[PDB]
Design a protein around this nucleic acid. Structure first.
Lengths: 63, 60
DNA sequence: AGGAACACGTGACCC
DNA sequence: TGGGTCACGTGTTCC
């Protein structure tokens, strides 16, 4: 009769996983590009590239 | 015998988790509000802060 | 104590 | 087929 807590915990865990996927999809929809499907890691990797690149170019544009 | 196979699979799986985590850390290092932080932020916050940061940039 | 974030191992599916 | 990602349920850690 502890199924209730397990079930609830499963619901809670799923909600985090889903928020996480939602955030990933949003990062990806924001990258210069772009051609899905990148997998999650690729989205992250390409997000990193974008910020380093924007940093470089943006810095360069002065001094 | 094919117990090795299952452990192989579960190792592949850990390699991916570890890679994503490092990417999350690396991303956080690139978002100033996260960077400025003593306590490590959780993974969802880091993602939320990173998209926030990106909407910040397009406004120049 | 107990929940939120995190880590794990495995079944379903894919190329 | 091999070997990879993903969603899941549940074990582990931390506050």
């Amino acid at each position: 009769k502890d199924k209730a807590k397990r079930v609830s915990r499963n619901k809670s865990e799923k909600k985090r996983r889903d928020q996480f996927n939602v955030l990933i999809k949003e990062l990806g929809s924001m990258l210069p590009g772009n051609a899905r499907k990148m997998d999650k890691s690729t989205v992250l990797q390409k997000s990193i590239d974008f910020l380093r690149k924007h940093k470089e170019i943006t810095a360069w544009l002065e001094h | 015998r094919i117990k090795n196979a299952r452990e192989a699979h579960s190792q592949i799986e850990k390699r991916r988790r570890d890679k994503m985590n490092s990417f999350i850390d690396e991303l956080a290092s690139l978002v100033p509000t996260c960077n400025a932080m003593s306590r490590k932020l959780d993974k969802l916050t880091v993602l939320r802060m990173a998209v926030q940061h990106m909407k910040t940039l397009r406004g120049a």
